[PDB]
Amino acid sequence: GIQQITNMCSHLQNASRARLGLTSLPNTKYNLALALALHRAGFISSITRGGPHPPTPEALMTYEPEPVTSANVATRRLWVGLKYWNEEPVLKELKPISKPSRLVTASLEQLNRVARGFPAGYMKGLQLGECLFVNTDRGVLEVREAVERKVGGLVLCKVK
Amino acid sequence: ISVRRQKKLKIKKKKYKKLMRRTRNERRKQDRL
Amino acid sequence: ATLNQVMRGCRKPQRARHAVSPALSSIKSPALKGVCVKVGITRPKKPNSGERKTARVRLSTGKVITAYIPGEGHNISQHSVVLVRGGRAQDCPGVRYHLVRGALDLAGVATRMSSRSKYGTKKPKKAS
Amino acid sequence: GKGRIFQAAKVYQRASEAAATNIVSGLPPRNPPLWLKAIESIPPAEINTRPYPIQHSPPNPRARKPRNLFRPTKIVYPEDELRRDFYRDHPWELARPRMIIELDGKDARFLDWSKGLRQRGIPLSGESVVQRQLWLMENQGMTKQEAYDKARHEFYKLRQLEQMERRIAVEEARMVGGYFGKDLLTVGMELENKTYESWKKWATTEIARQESARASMYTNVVDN
RNA sequence: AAUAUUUUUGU
RNA sequence: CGCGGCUCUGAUUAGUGUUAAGUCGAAAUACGGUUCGUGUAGUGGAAGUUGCACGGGACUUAUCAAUGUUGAACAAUACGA
RNA sequence: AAGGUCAUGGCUUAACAAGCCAAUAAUUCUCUUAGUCGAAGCUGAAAAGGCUGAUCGACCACAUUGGGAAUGAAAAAAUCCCAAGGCAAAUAGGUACAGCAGUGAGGAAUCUUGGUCAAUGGGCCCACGCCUGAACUGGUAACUUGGAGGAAUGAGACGUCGAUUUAUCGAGUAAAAUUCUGUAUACAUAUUGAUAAUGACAAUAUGUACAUUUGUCUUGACUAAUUACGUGCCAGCAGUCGCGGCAAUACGUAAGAGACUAGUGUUAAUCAUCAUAAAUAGGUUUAAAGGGUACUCAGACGGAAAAAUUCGCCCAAAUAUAGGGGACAAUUUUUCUAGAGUUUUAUGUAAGAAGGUCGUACUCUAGAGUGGAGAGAUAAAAUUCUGUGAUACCUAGGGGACGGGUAAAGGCGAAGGCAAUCUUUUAUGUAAAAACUGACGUCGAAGGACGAAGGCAAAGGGAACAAAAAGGAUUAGAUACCCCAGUAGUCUUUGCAGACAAUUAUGAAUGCCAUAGGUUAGAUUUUUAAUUUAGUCUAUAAAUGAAAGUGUAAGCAUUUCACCUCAAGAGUAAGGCGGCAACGCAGGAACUGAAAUCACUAGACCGUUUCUGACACCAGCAAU
RNA sequence: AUAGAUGAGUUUGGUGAUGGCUCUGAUUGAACACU
Ligand SMILES: [K+]
Ligand SMILES: [K+]
Ligand SMILES: [K+]
Ligand SMILES: [K+]
Ligand SMILES: [K+]
Ligand SMILES: [K+]
Ligand SMILES: [K+]
Ligand SMILES: [K+]
Ligand SMILES: [Mg+2]
Ligand SMILES: [Mg+2]
Ligand SMILES: [Mg+2]
Ligand SMILES: [Mg+2]
Ligand SMILES: [Mg+2]
Ligand SMILES: [Mg+2]
Ligand SMILES: [Mg+2]
Ligand SMILES: [Mg+2]
Ligand SMILES: [Mg+2]
Ligand SMILES: [Mg+2]
Ligand SMILES: [Mg+2]
Ligand SMILES: [Mg+2]
Ligand SMILES: [Mg+2]
Ligand SMILES: [Mg+2]
Ligand SMILES: [Mg+2]
Ligand SMILES: [Mg+2]
Ligand SMILES: [Mg+2]
Ligand SMILES: [Mg+2]
Ligand SMILES: [Mg+2]
Ligand SMILES: [Mg+2]
Ligand SMILES: [Mg+2]
Ligand SMILES: [Mg+2]
Ligand SMILES: [Mg+2]
Ligand SMILES: [Mg+2]
Ligand SMILES: [Mg+2]
Ligand SMILES: [Mg+2]
Ligand SMILES: [Mg+2]
Ligand SMILES: [Mg+2]
Ligand SMILES: [Mg+2]
Ligand SMILES: [Mg+2]
Ligand SMILES: [Mg+2]
Ligand SMILES: [Mg+2]
Ligand SMILES: [Mg+2]
Ligand SMILES: [Mg+2]
Ligand SMILES: [Mg+2]
Ligand SMILES: [Mg+2]
Ligand SMILES: [Mg+2]
Ligand SMILES: [Mg+2]
Ligand SMILES: [Mg+2]
Ligand SMILES: [Mg+2]
Ligand SMILES: [Mg+2]
Ligand SMILES: [Mg+2]
Ligand SMILES: [Mg+2]
Ligand SMILES: [Mg+2]
Ligand SMILES: [Mg+2]
Ligand SMILES: [Mg+2]
Ligand SMILES: [Mg+2]
Ligand SMILES: [Mg+2]
Ligand SMILES: [Mg+2]
Ligand SMILES: [Mg+2]
Ligand SMILES: [Mg+2]
Ligand SMILES: [Mg+2]
Ligand SMILES: [Mg+2]
Ligand SMILES: [Mg+2]
Ligand SMILES: [Mg+2]
Ligand SMILES: [Mg+2]
Ligand SMILES: [Mg+2]
Ligand SMILES: [Mg+2]
Ligand SMILES: [Mg+2]
């Protein structure tokens, strides 16, 4: 549920704050959705699921994970490659919005306003470098992707 | 709460505890216990 | 506070603050008329020193307030109908009102040349 | 926060901006520092980024929530188990001094362990037995014990000749008029004398000192 | 090592 | 007409606020000169003080009788502050 | 089952059944207050913004107060009937200005006892026409808004005024004077408001004519703007901080200066300021504020991979018919094992309870013990003990409660709390592997249970300690601190009671973040010594914080409960609830304020530690 | 509706916080004083 995305937002911050090369996340359908959005946005390096130990860094991309059946699903995990440039992390902040206590849904007319630095609803305008991820019917897109696809949905988190 | 301020509450609760004793019999005559 | 605690009514108004002139603030009136009950003198508190001219007044509503007499020299006494306005003597406890000097019975300072509007003094009409 | 903000990695980015424009608006920027162009194309390396360290041993596969994923692991070789077995069976082999100070690092270039225990550059010690054992055990397909016996007996035949040379070399020199200095046995005894004498001085001094304590226990100041 | 008299006030 | 509620008032009586210039002590802040506070139960003109358990917002404020070493001779073309 | 209805519905009726709604207030009751609403008015950058509920529109109610019916298509009346009081009236049987104007009263405060039905609307009428205090128009008020309210020239009247440097600094292009305009307004003319006709009253256009007031606040800082004299904590000023005690930029005068202007200030009020009740969007270690505890009903929140249903969510509105998209969401179904649980006697362990005991010391009795004058107390003493033989040293019988070492930064329970010992008895928790159930989970208002010491009630016990009461000292006084003695009480059993610095000054829980040095109970191993699980404790990194500091959290996030909204009054009053009582729970307002409050920094002080100087002291001599 | 988000004085020996109060802005079916 949304509780998993919240834990993922905090952990990715703590990992970047600790300047760690690799980071692990529980293998779930929801976490893989946001992870692909961060990777497609350019914040993380790669995503590969594996066991409790990280894959061989030399062959990260070439890593051939084994099938995920009920005999090992309890041990799988998503291994994310963090990014650091110019003595500063690329995923500094991952402030969430939709928490378990309240789910915030935004409309297309509002995302069009938030995409240009103007508040709308329980959100605030996006400034230089910021980024907003929205969970919609077409997957976990970015506010600028959802605005292009003309759809609204559930706001997940804001990335700086 | 500091100790200096706690002594302000200490004097208030004592003077009250001391007052309810003095007027205990008077409050018993009027059925105000 | 959690959203649930707010749903049950945890947000209550802040405790009210006392007004400088309750008799006027309570009924939303700018001024009231009262009969002077006593014209005496009040002493300021620790820092200030002197004899502040005050007047115990019984407003039309019924409240008995203590008003301050501004200016130098007054002509009011027992049973004087005077107009009371808001204000307060910052150094005199209980003196939470002022008296208009161009009021019904209270006269304005005749030897006032500056701020005559504050003391109800007509212009001297020297040339006129 | 006892630390300080160190910006040593951005000395170029900072110096490059301060030298782009002039403080006195309306004039061209003065020449930059002489070092700004030298390291123009030599950026710093990435620091403070914990990677997955090299695993010198198969990590525990049964662990579901493993810790210390960013901790350097211990370097263990197959020889470590052989060194412990040999030197434990030959404890006094450690008394034989061995130099661990390398000359040029090119010592493993002339080591061919198919010839024998005696190699070029390294002394005949418990390591040569280990390296010879590991070779036979791997190449010749011998067991740990079999290879150990073979490599261990070659070590003895070479050490025996070493002790026989010292005895004969001295005896041979005196048969032609060759005299030597003080052997180690004599020098060792002379040193014990100088130390034993110092202990005797300490014993007699303390012994006499204890007599005063024994007499001071009782009181005889009255001189009855 | 186990010792212990009293000693208020300051527009 | 009865009951209940509500407002005003009441001999007598209680608490508290304010007011530089009075009197009596010196409880706290230093080891405040009896460690101070919490609870509870007594007691004293007043602050206070006493028993019982509890807290540190007081003792981490801590700083050697292990008294501190001939740890392999000497001489050489070795060695040379 | 039947009737009724367009149709549906105990809507209606008959016979059976005992159900339906709610459990956290459905239902009912008391008190206080109010006409409701709208971008209608005001206000904010903004929030499902805030406030008001005038003028405008919609809705509700009322027409002196209270109690009522009929007529009619429809009560939708200032009607009608009845009662009471006020005015009037008497055998009468009217009136109630919250209809317009107006009068009195109240109040800080709000208008003409006009004209006309010409226009718009309405009622009556075949028609003409009659009636209209609605309405349209004139009047009063700076209450508000909008506009006018005068522009250009102006240097030698070689004058005047105030300062002072007689020439400096100003009044000052200011004035006078000259050249133009004809603004508000006045008057005339014309058109128009109206047309079938009707004009109460006025607007608009054009022509001609006239150049008409200053007032007020401020002047220490916030806050734009200065001196002089007088006054002397007096008189006074003040929105806040403050000013005034004899050379006051703050008071009162005079002059100058700053600003608004037919207005200007003041008082009152509202919004914003204020993230200052924070849904957006807060916070609770030391500053207001974590509940004593966690089992738990309701209630919020909570895995994996699929499917049905809703069509929630989105396109996406206008409160959108009917559809589309399927990530997420709600109910539900099938599987899964990472959460939470069960089994395999763990080890270890002062959780708890029952029945019993052990021992060191203390105390009591006896042995007409030994011994024969002191003992104990305190800084010193006194009260006190002892010749009726004490203290001291023994013997033999009892009697109560206590828990030495081990012992540690140790451990155990939800907390409170638990430390001699044996038997009996009881729930969690931790390690290692396997197996099993398959989201069964976390938090949790309320209720209930538990809850230290002290206390109340009843019966036991009573050695020791010790509130009270009492005495002896100290002291200026001494209830006190000290001392001689000493009752409740402490202990046992059965109840009440529920307050604590019930503390980690830090609620519980989940996910997550880099190291090191100790330590506790286990596990594994090449059991030497290193890995490792769950705890606890020091010192750090990133970070965080007001800082102190924390750093298995006071960090990054999340869930949920409790609690906080300046000080003081006050955790107080009143009513109520619980209790035998003591007291507990709950819980205001008036009066008075501009501050309360936290951490840190540097000093000073200490009947504070360790030092360093000095006839400071000791000693000696001399002197007063 | 895309220009709309602002501070100041005041606690302390002093610094940094916390937390009020007051001023700055707009307004009234307003009243009063001097005009
Ligand atoms: K301390
Ligand atoms: K759907
Ligand atoms: K005897
Ligand atoms: K435990
Ligand atoms: K005693
Ligand atoms: K109980
Ligand atoms: K540890
Ligand atoms: K009270
Ligand atoms: Mg507090
Ligand atoms: Mg004041
Ligand atoms: Mg003036
Ligand atoms: Mg003035
Ligand atoms: Mg003093
Ligand atoms: Mg009375
Ligand atoms: Mg004391
Ligand atoms: Mg004292
Ligand atoms: Mg003390
Ligand atoms: Mg105490
Ligand atoms: Mg006593
Ligand atoms: Mg202290
Ligand atoms: Mg009303
Ligand atoms: Mg009404
Ligand atoms: Mg009227
Ligand atoms: Mg009337
Ligand atoms: Mg009147
Ligand atoms: Mg008409
Ligand atoms: Mg008509
Ligand atoms: Mg007609
Ligand atoms: Mg004209
Ligand atoms: Mg007509
Ligand atoms: Mg200024
Ligand atoms: Mg001040
Ligand atoms: Mg002045
Ligand atoms: Mg005007
Ligand atoms: Mg607590
Ligand atoms: Mg409680
Ligand atoms: Mg409490
Ligand atoms: Mg659909
Ligand atoms: Mg299953
Ligand atoms: Mg299985
Ligand atoms: Mg499990
Ligand atoms: Mg056991
Ligand atoms: Mg005898
Ligand atoms: Mg016993
Ligand atoms: Mg405890
Ligand atoms: Mg013990
Ligand atoms: Mg629970
Ligand atoms: Mg409860
Ligand atoms: Mg008890
Ligand atoms: Mg008891
Ligand atoms: Mg009893
Ligand atoms: Mg006494
Ligand atoms: Mg007990
Ligand atoms: Mg306790
Ligand atoms: Mg709790
Ligand atoms: Mg412990
Ligand atoms: Mg620490
Ligand atoms: Mg924080
Ligand atoms: Mg309070
Ligand atoms: Mg309470
Ligand atoms: Mg009460
Ligand atoms: Mg200091
Ligand atoms: Mg001297
Ligand atoms: Mg002397
Ligand atoms: Mg003499
Ligand atoms: Mg201070
Ligand atoms: Mg603050």
mmCIF file of all heavy atoms in Angstrom, chain G residues 118-127:
data_model
loop_
_atom_site.group_PDB
_atom_site.id
_atom_site.type_symbol
_atom_site.label_atom_id
_atom_site.label_comp_id
_atom_site.label_asym_id
_atom_site.label_seq_id
_atom_site.Cartn_x
_atom_site.Cartn_y
_atom_site.Cartn_z
ATOM 1 P P A G 118 -51.853 61.546 -13.298
ATOM 2 O OP1 A G 118 -52.466 62.788 -12.764
ATOM 3 O OP2 A G 118 -52.626 60.681 -14.224
ATOM 4 O "O5'" A G 118 -50.489 61.936 -14.016
ATOM 5 C "C5'" A G 118 -50.474 62.381 -15.361
ATOM 6 C "C4'" A G 118 -49.068 62.467 -15.891
ATOM 7 O "O4'" A G 118 -48.279 63.334 -15.035
ATOM 8 C "C3'" A G 118 -48.290 61.161 -15.919
ATOM 9 O "O3'" A G 118 -48.576 60.367 -17.057
ATOM 10 C "C2'" A G 118 -46.847 61.635 -15.855
ATOM 11 O "O2'" A G 118 -46.403 62.087 -17.125
ATOM 12 C "C1'" A G 118 -46.965 62.836 -14.923
ATOM 13 N N9 A G 118 -46.721 62.483 -13.512
ATOM 14 C C8 A G 118 -47.568 62.683 -12.454
ATOM 15 N N7 A G 118 -47.091 62.278 -11.305
ATOM 16 C C5 A G 118 -45.841 61.781 -11.630
ATOM 17 C C6 A G 118 -44.833 61.202 -10.848
ATOM 18 N N6 A G 118 -44.940 61.028 -9.533
ATOM 19 N N1 A G 118 -43.702 60.809 -11.469
ATOM 20 C C2 A G 118 -43.607 60.990 -12.791
ATOM 21 N N3 A G 118 -44.487 61.520 -13.636
ATOM 22 C C4 A G 118 -45.596 61.902 -12.984
ATOM 23 P P A G 119 -48.663 58.767 -16.929
ATOM 24 O OP1 A G 119 -49.085 58.221 -18.241
ATOM 25 O OP2 A G 119 -49.441 58.437 -15.710
ATOM 26 O "O5'" A G 119 -47.158 58.319 -16.674
ATOM 27 C "C5'" A G 119 -46.174 58.462 -17.685
ATOM 28 C "C4'" A G 119 -44.836 57.941 -17.229
ATOM 29 O "O4'" A G 119 -44.410 58.672 -16.051
ATOM 30 C "C3'" A G 119 -44.801 56.482 -16.801
ATOM 31 O "O3'" A G 119 -44.653 55.593 -17.894
ATOM 32 C "C2'" A G 119 -43.631 56.442 -15.828
ATOM 33 O "O2'" A G 119 -42.392 56.361 -16.515
ATOM 34 C "C1'" A G 119 -43.736 57.810 -15.162
ATOM 35 N N9 A G 119 -44.476 57.765 -13.887
ATOM 36 C C8 A G 119 -45.726 58.257 -13.614
ATOM 37 N N7 A G 119 -46.113 58.073 -12.378
ATOM 38 C C5 A G 119 -45.040 57.418 -11.795
ATOM 39 C C6 A G 119 -44.820 56.940 -10.494
ATOM 40 N N6 A G 119 -45.705 57.057 -9.507
ATOM 41 N N1 A G 119 -43.643 56.332 -10.238
ATOM 42 C C2 A G 119 -42.757 56.218 -11.232
ATOM 43 N N3 A G 119 -42.846 56.626 -12.493
ATOM 44 C C4 A G 119 -44.026 57.224 -12.711
ATOM 45 P P U G 120 -45.580 54.286 -18.015
ATOM 46 O OP1 U G 120 -45.330 53.681 -19.346
ATOM 47 O OP2 U G 120 -46.965 54.640 -17.620
ATOM 48 O "O5'" U G 120 -44.988 53.298 -16.918
ATOM 49 C "C5'" U G 120 -43.714 52.703 -17.096
ATOM 50 C "C4'" U G 120 -43.271 51.948 -15.870
ATOM 51 O "O4'" U G 120 -43.016 52.875 -14.779
ATOM 52 C "C3'" U G 120 -44.272 50.971 -15.281
ATOM 53 O "O3'" U G 120 -44.353 49.741 -15.977
ATOM 54 C "C2'" U G 120 -43.778 50.839 -13.850
ATOM 55 O "O2'" U G 120 -42.615 50.029 -13.784
ATOM 56 C "C1'" U G 120 -43.383 52.278 -13.551
ATOM 57 N N1 U G 120 -44.516 53.029 -12.969
ATOM 58 C C2 U G 120 -44.718 52.924 -11.610
ATOM 59 O O2 U G 120 -43.992 52.270 -10.883
ATOM 60 N N3 U G 120 -45.792 53.629 -11.131
ATOM 61 C C4 U G 120 -46.671 54.399 -11.860
ATOM 62 O O4 U G 120 -47.594 54.973 -11.281
ATOM 63 C C5 U G 120 -46.403 54.444 -13.262
ATOM 64 C C6 U G 120 -45.363 53.768 -13.752
ATOM 65 P P G G 121 -45.775 49.011 -16.135
ATOM 66 O OP1 G G 121 -45.583 47.815 -16.989
ATOM 67 O OP2 G G 121 -46.773 50.036 -16.530
ATOM 68 O "O5'" G G 121 -46.130 48.524 -14.661
ATOM 69 C "C5'" G G 121 -45.351 47.528 -14.021
ATOM 70 C "C4'" G G 121 -45.792 47.284 -12.600
ATOM 71 O "O4'" G G 121 -45.599 48.477 -11.798
ATOM 72 C "C3'" G G 121 -47.256 46.947 -12.387
ATOM 73 O "O3'" G G 121 -47.587 45.610 -12.711
ATOM 74 C "C2'" G G 121 -47.447 47.279 -10.915
ATOM 75 O "O2'" G G 121 -46.921 46.254 -10.086
ATOM 76 C "C1'" G G 121 -46.571 48.521 -10.773
ATOM 77 N N9 G G 121 -47.361 49.757 -10.906
ATOM 78 C C8 G G 121 -47.481 50.570 -12.002
ATOM 79 N N7 G G 121 -48.272 51.587 -11.800
ATOM 80 C C5 G G 121 -48.706 51.430 -10.492
ATOM 81 C C6 G G 121 -49.580 52.221 -9.707
ATOM 82 O O6 G G 121 -50.173 53.259 -10.019
ATOM 83 N N1 G G 121 -49.741 51.694 -8.432
ATOM 84 C C2 G G 121 -49.141 50.551 -7.969
ATOM 85 N N2 G G 121 -49.419 50.198 -6.708
ATOM 86 N N3 G G 121 -48.323 49.806 -8.688
ATOM 87 C C4 G G 121 -48.154 50.302 -9.930
ATOM 88 P P G G 122 -49.098 45.236 -13.104
ATOM 89 O OP1 G G 122 -49.133 43.805 -13.484
ATOM 90 O OP2 G G 122 -49.596 46.261 -14.052
ATOM 91 O "O5'" G G 122 -49.901 45.394 -11.739
ATOM 92 C "C5'" G G 122 -49.643 44.538 -10.637
ATOM 93 C "C4'" G G 122 -50.411 44.963 -9.412
ATOM 94 O "O4'" G G 122 -50.076 46.332 -9.063
ATOM 95 C "C3'" G G 122 -51.923 44.981 -9.543
ATOM 96 O "O3'" G G 122 -52.514 43.701 -9.421
ATOM 97 C "C2'" G G 122 -52.333 45.950 -8.445
ATOM 98 O "O2'" G G 122 -52.301 45.328 -7.170
ATOM 99 C "C1'" G G 122 -51.210 46.979 -8.522
ATOM 100 N N9 G G 122 -51.567 48.117 -9.387
ATOM 101 C C8 G G 122 -51.187 48.325 -10.687
ATOM 102 N N7 G G 122 -51.664 49.426 -11.193
ATOM 103 C C5 G G 122 -52.407 49.980 -10.163
ATOM 104 C C6 G G 122 -53.162 51.179 -10.116
ATOM 105 O O6 G G 122 -53.330 52.022 -11.004
ATOM 106 N N1 G G 122 -53.757 51.355 -8.874
ATOM 107 C C2 G G 122 -53.642 50.495 -7.815
ATOM 108 N N2 G G 122 -54.297 50.846 -6.703
ATOM 109 N N3 G G 122 -52.945 49.374 -7.844
ATOM 110 C C4 G G 122 -52.356 49.184 -9.041
ATOM 111 P P G G 123 -53.888 43.373 -10.184
ATOM 112 O OP1 G G 123 -54.119 41.910 -10.105
ATOM 113 O OP2 G G 123 -53.864 44.041 -11.509
ATOM 114 O "O5'" G G 123 -54.988 44.090 -9.287
ATOM 115 C "C5'" G G 123 -55.258 43.636 -7.971
ATOM 116 C "C4'" G G 123 -56.298 44.489 -7.293
ATOM 117 O "O4'" G G 123 -55.786 45.834 -7.112
ATOM 118 C "C3'" G G 123 -57.598 44.692 -8.053
ATOM 119 O "O3'" G G 123 -58.486 43.595 -7.947
ATOM 120 C "C2'" G G 123 -58.128 45.984 -7.451
ATOM 121 O "O2'" G G 123 -58.730 45.756 -6.186
ATOM 122 C "C1'" G G 123 -56.835 46.769 -7.246
ATOM 123 N N9 G G 123 -56.544 47.646 -8.393
ATOM 124 C C8 G G 123 -55.687 47.408 -9.438
ATOM 125 N N7 G G 123 -55.652 48.382 -10.303
ATOM 126 C C5 G G 123 -56.540 49.318 -9.797
ATOM 127 C C6 G G 123 -56.925 50.585 -10.298
ATOM 128 O O6 G G 123 -56.544 51.155 -11.326
ATOM 129 N N1 G G 123 -57.853 51.199 -9.466
ATOM 130 C C2 G G 123 -58.348 50.666 -8.305
ATOM 131 N N2 G G 123 -59.238 51.408 -7.637
ATOM 132 N N3 G G 123 -57.998 49.488 -7.826
ATOM 133 C C4 G G 123 -57.097 48.878 -8.619
ATOM 134 P P C G 124 -59.355 43.134 -9.217
ATOM 135 O OP1 C G 124 -59.991 41.836 -8.884
ATOM 136 O OP2 C G 124 -58.504 43.243 -10.428
ATOM 137 O "O5'" C G 124 -60.505 44.232 -9.322
ATOM 138 C "C5'" C G 124 -61.401 44.433 -8.241
ATOM 139 C "C4'" C G 124 -62.268 45.653 -8.431
ATOM 140 O "O4'" C G 124 -61.462 46.858 -8.365
ATOM 141 C "C3'" C G 124 -62.995 45.771 -9.760
ATOM 142 O "O3'" C G 124 -64.168 44.981 -9.831
ATOM 143 C "C2'" C G 124 -63.274 47.265 -9.845
ATOM 144 O "O2'" C G 124 -64.391 47.625 -9.046
ATOM 145 C "C1'" C G 124 -62.010 47.846 -9.214
ATOM 146 N N1 C G 124 -61.011 48.221 -10.237
ATOM 147 C C2 C G 124 -61.125 49.472 -10.845
ATOM 148 O O2 C G 124 -62.047 50.226 -10.503
ATOM 149 N N3 C G 124 -60.229 49.831 -11.788
ATOM 150 C C4 C G 124 -59.254 48.990 -12.127
ATOM 151 N N4 C G 124 -58.394 49.386 -13.063
ATOM 152 C C5 C G 124 -59.118 47.708 -11.527
ATOM 153 C C6 C G 124 -60.013 47.366 -10.595
ATOM 154 P P C G 125 -64.523 44.180 -11.179
ATOM 155 O OP1 C G 125 -65.741 43.373 -10.922
ATOM 156 O OP2 C G 125 -63.290 43.508 -11.655
ATOM 157 O "O5'" C G 125 -64.898 45.320 -12.227
ATOM 158 C "C5'" C G 125 -65.981 46.206 -11.988
ATOM 159 C "C4'" C G 125 -65.988 47.356 -12.965
ATOM 160 O "O4'" C G 125 -64.781 48.148 -12.812
ATOM 161 C "C3'" C G 125 -65.998 46.987 -14.440
ATOM 162 O "O3'" C G 125 -67.280 46.638 -14.929
ATOM 163 C "C2'" C G 125 -65.428 48.236 -15.095
ATOM 164 O "O2'" C G 125 -66.415 49.249 -15.217
ATOM 165 C "C1'" C G 125 -64.391 48.676 -14.063
ATOM 166 N N1 C G 125 -63.039 48.185 -14.407
ATOM 167 C C2 C G 125 -62.326 48.879 -15.385
ATOM 168 O O2 C G 125 -62.845 49.874 -15.910
ATOM 169 N N3 C G 125 -61.092 48.456 -15.732
ATOM 170 C C4 C G 125 -60.573 47.382 -15.141
ATOM 171 N N4 C G 125 -59.354 47.000 -15.518
ATOM 172 C C5 C G 125 -61.280 46.650 -14.145
ATOM 173 C C6 C G 125 -62.502 47.082 -13.812
ATOM 174 P P C G 126 -67.464 45.329 -15.842
ATOM 175 O OP1 C G 126 -68.913 45.159 -16.112
ATOM 176 O OP2 C G 126 -66.702 44.219 -15.218
ATOM 177 O "O5'" C G 126 -66.746 45.705 -17.214
ATOM 178 C "C5'" C G 126 -66.365 44.683 -18.123
ATOM 179 C "C4'" C G 126 -66.551 45.095 -19.562
ATOM 180 O "O4'" C G 126 -67.943 45.416 -19.817
ATOM 181 C "C3'" C G 126 -65.799 46.340 -20.002
ATOM 182 O "O3'" C G 126 -64.440 46.085 -20.309
ATOM 183 C "C2'" C G 126 -66.608 46.807 -21.205
ATOM 184 O "O2'" C G 126 -66.273 46.065 -22.368
ATOM 185 C "C1'" C G 126 -68.030 46.446 -20.779
ATOM 186 N N1 C G 126 -68.743 47.601 -20.193
ATOM 187 C C2 C G 126 -69.238 48.580 -21.056
ATOM 188 O O2 C G 126 -69.064 48.443 -22.276
ATOM 189 N N3 C G 126 -69.892 49.646 -20.545
ATOM 190 C C4 C G 126 -70.055 49.752 -19.227
ATOM 191 N N4 C G 126 -70.707 50.819 -18.763
ATOM 192 C C5 C G 126 -69.558 48.769 -18.325
ATOM 193 C C6 C G 126 -68.914 47.719 -18.845
ATOM 194 P P A G 127 -63.283 47.029 -19.718
ATOM 195 O OP1 A G 127 -61.986 46.552 -20.258
ATOM 196 O OP2 A G 127 -63.473 47.131 -18.250
ATOM 197 O "O5'" A G 127 -63.582 48.457 -20.355
ATOM 198 C "C5'" A G 127 -63.480 48.670 -21.755
ATOM 199 C "C4'" A G 127 -64.188 49.933 -22.174
ATOM 200 O "O4'" A G 127 -65.573 49.879 -21.747
ATOM 201 C "C3'" A G 127 -63.662 51.222 -21.563
ATOM 202 O "O3'" A G 127 -62.522 51.723 -22.238
ATOM 203 C "C2'" A G 127 -64.872 52.143 -21.638
ATOM 204 O "O2'" A G 127 -65.026 52.684 -22.941
ATOM 205 C "C1'" A G 127 -66.015 51.166 -21.374
ATOM 206 N N9 A G 127 -66.408 51.135 -19.953
ATOM 207 C C8 A G 127 -66.095 50.186 -19.014
ATOM 208 N N7 A G 127 -66.596 50.426 -17.828
ATOM 209 C C5 A G 127 -67.289 51.614 -17.999
ATOM 210 C C6 A G 127 -68.044 52.403 -17.116
ATOM 211 N N6 A G 127 -68.231 52.095 -15.833
ATOM 212 N N1 A G 127 -68.606 53.530 -17.600
ATOM 213 C C2 A G 127 -68.416 53.833 -18.889
ATOM 214 N N3 A G 127 -67.729 53.175 -19.818
ATOM 215 C C4 A G 127 -67.184 52.061 -19.302
#
